[PDB]
Amino acid sequence: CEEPPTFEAMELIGKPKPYYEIGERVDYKCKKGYFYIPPLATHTICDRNHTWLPVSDDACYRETCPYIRDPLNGQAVPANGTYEFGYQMHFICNEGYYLIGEEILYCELKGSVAIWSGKPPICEKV
Amino acid sequence: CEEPPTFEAMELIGKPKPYYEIGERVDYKCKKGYFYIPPLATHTICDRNHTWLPVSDDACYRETCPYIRDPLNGQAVPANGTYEFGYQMHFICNEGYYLIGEEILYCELKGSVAIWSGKPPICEKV
Amino acid sequence: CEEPPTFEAMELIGKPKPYYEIGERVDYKCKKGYFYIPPLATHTICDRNHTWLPVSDDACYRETCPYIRDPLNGQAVPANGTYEFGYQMHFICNEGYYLIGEEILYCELKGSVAIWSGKPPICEKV
Amino acid sequence: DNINTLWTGVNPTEANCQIMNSSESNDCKLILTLVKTGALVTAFVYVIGVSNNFNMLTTHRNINFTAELFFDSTGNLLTRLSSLKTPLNHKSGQNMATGAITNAKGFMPSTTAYPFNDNSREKENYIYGTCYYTASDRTAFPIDISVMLNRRAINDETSYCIRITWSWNTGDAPEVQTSATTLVTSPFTFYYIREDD
Amino acid sequence: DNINTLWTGVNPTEANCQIMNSSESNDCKLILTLVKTGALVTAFVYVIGVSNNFNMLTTHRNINFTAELFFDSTGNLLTRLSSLKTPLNHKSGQNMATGAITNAKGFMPSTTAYPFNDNSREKENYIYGTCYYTASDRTAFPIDISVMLNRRAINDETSYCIRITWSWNTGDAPEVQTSATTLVTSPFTFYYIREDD
Amino acid sequence: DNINTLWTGVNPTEANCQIMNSSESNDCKLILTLVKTGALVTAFVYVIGVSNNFNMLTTHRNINFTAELFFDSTGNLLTRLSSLKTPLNHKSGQNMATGAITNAKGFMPSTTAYPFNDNSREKENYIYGTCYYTASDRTAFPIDISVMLNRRAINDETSYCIRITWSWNTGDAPEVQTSATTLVTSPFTFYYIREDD
Ligand SMILES: *[C@@H]1O[C@H](CO)[C@@H](O[C@@H]2O[C@H](CO)[C@@H](O[C@@H]3O[C@H](CO)[C@@H](O)[C@H](O)[C@@H]3O)[C@H](O)[C@H]2NC(C)=O)[C@H](O)[C@H]1NC(C)=O
């Protein structure tokens, strides 16, 4: 087997090597900003014929921003149907009200944590 | 026995009932602002003839305000001969001095604690 | 033996006495501002002939002020070749620079601790 | 040999404590662990809000609630008088054991060290410290804790008392309508001299 | 019978921890002591800086470093994944014993009390407090400590997790070029419910 | 089997400590409890003022007193050198036992973890925290605590040292003439690696 595969949500533990012998194991770990959820594997062994066993990075999900309920008399909607970082939250106030603290928040990654690009807005009487 | 007696410094533990059978016990607990001092009882049993045994609320004394020594060159006197709440502390400065921070404090109940309605006064040279 | 000897960096534990019998022991303790370093003794016994055994206060060294490295582009020098209290630290900045926060600090005793009479200076571009 | 712990068991199915008086039915889930360590008892405590009302206090600028715990002459929780509505017991995995408690007295706050009605030693009946509510935006919101060890008895049954009280009063509430969720305090560990068995 | 302590041993010859990522080779000497006390574990921890870079952080106005500790299904340190690059063991005088660890699981932070991926109980995975760096002029510089008990697993091996993180951000750094020396935190002792053996 | 506690016993009849130097005769009653818990020692301490002078410090805006405790090569209190003028002993109900102390060394602050005259490890000899004096109007007055574990020996007898020091310096004193009473600190519990037996 040659240098193990690389992934987007999971990286290799330790420095890679050019060649690998049969029966050798290589381990990965969810990258910064991701986390593990059983039961999928994050390691793989170099079998008889020098091609690693099947392996994915699907056991590693992105960190999510905290929950945000609808701002009284308004509505908060996960623009991208997800709280995961790399996405956004949108706010539309109801008919008789108007929105103040502008009305898009971006769930972004900051270090090892997903956090909203700001604070929820509010709806007022009009 | 019918609904247990009620008291001013002690209340019934649990909801009362219209009728009670012989040998039944009912318990009280000093009310908010009071405390227990042995050895008087705070419970009673419905005897053979359906009239509770003797029972008092004298085991429950009122919470008291902290102590207050005479303000240098003056005198602090428990107007009502007690530190217990529902009473007051009075301050008279001595002859050659005059009182400043007015000179009555009321030991009052606040929640589950007896506390002075303010701060002691002081006496100055004149 | 008569009243035990007295020392500058070590004092007597307990009240002294005019006369002392053979085989008696007297103990000292480093004074305020000093500390012990093995293995020299700090006690002595009144021998057969009424003259205490040899004893010193050399096991008690003075408390020292914290270390101070050369202020970038300048030099800090222990004027008296020691960090011990009762001495001083001097600062000369290098040729192309000039000294600001004046340039003598006195390692002084304050209570039970030796501390610098202030803060190190700094050197600037000129 | 888990008879050195007398605890509520780890995270209980249903709420076990009723902290809010403006309430009825057990508004929260109080976790408490008393461990015999030398002549002292290590008290470990915090709370998991369960009822919507209690959980919504985090939206308030100035709060404080108390958990009153009374025990009888033997070291047994007085359930009708206490906030913790269900007895404590020894360790049995992550749960409360189910049998006779061995030496409960031993876990009680010593009456010798913390007395009743002694105004000259009153000051000695208090323990203070801080726990933290971890807010939505992940910031640590400090909550003040006062603890009174059996100073005032409530009647002829309460032989020992432990009253913990959390509080906070700042310019802003640790939460807001849209962000609120559960009211949780971080473990607060304190110490006290124990009564003799 | 020192099988109630699972610790790094007292002040190790060479650095045992690599806290700074901007680093390689073990920049400090992390001292850690977990003691089984009742249904709880007493965690005792602090750090002794060794490498010049780490020691020089005290000259910075806003810092924070983390020590990530992962254990497997049996309670054994995952050395390649953790900051502590050398296993823990039982007490043997002031040093780590050299043999099979008796009931390591017992020292791990209970998954029942501190779960994985449960957003409804997330708040329950945190511990906070303060330690103090004792500066040159002898003043006490407070350092903030956050502790996360196994909330996020790092892969299919990490069965438990303990992440301690020190931080500070004031107007002035706790030190200055001429006064800096070693970066040392005072012992920070915290508590947590332990997993069952 | 109370040989895991080496303590002053609960609230002593007469004062046992002389904290104020401006004093003579034992001005207060120092309560101290060291319990062997794993490779660590749990220190529990606070003070009950007894003499009028000491009790009156609460009327001062800036105070601080120290309780110096020295032990010899065996773990025995050096009474003439220490503030605590009466030996410690094992638990016997709420009192000090009366016999040979079993493994006193075991309770001493390890010289390996907290050394003598090592300026490169000095910072490692300190422990800090907070206790609270509970004032008349019931408010909690915080008092600063610094602890130095055997760094400087006092002579050829002091093999170990424990120096606790309380202090406070605010705009106003925690009390006033008419309200003052007794000076009492709340239990302050700290931890340290213990010497080997
Ligand atoms: C998260 O959901 C939002 C909302 O659907 C997505 O952001 C929006 O994406 C659209 C198209 O992808 C952007 O539209 C562009 O607008 C310009 C002028 O406004 C127009 O000329 C272009 O032809 C195009 O339609 C829109 O700007 C953007 N909204 C914001 C806030 O900038 C986003 O793509 C979703 N994220 C992911 C990863 O899918």
Ligand SMILES: *[C@@H]1O[C@H](CO)[C@@H](O[C@@H]2O[C@H](CO)[C@@H](O[C@@H]3O[C@H](CO)[C@@H](O)[C@H](O)[C@@H]3O)[C@H](O)[C@H]2NC(C)=O)[C@H](O)[C@H]1NC(C)=O
């Ligand atoms: C606590 O002790 C104080 C002092 O004795 C009592 O308060 C005072 O009570 C008297 C009579 O009960 C009040 O006097 C009234 O004064 C008005 C005019 O000042 C007069 O016209 C009435 O005929 C009457 O004499 C007095 O106002 C009151 N002092 C204060 C501070 O208001 C109090 O009764 C004692 N408390 C208890 C529960 O006994």
Ligand SMILES: *[C@@H]1O[C@H](CO)[C@@H](O[C@@H]2O[C@H](CO)[C@@H](O[C@@H]3O[C@H](CO)[C@@H](O)[C@H](O)[C@@H]3O)[C@H](O)[C@H]2NC(C)=O)[C@H](O)[C@H]1NC(C)=O
């Ligand atoms: C610590 O080292 C310093 C530096 O050598 C010593 O302080 C300096 O001591 C000298 C002589 O002992 C003082 O000199 C005097 O100066 C006046 C006028 O400046 C002159 O008229 C006198 O004849 C004399 O030479 C000098 O003032 C003093 N420096 C300072 C900062 O005041 C010091 O003696 C050493 N300490 C010990 C204990 O040895």
Ligand SMILES: [Ca+2]
């Ligand atoms: Ca994927």
Ligand SMILES: [Ca+2]
């Ligand atoms: Ca009555």
Ligand SMILES: [Ca+2]
């Ligand atoms: Ca000398």
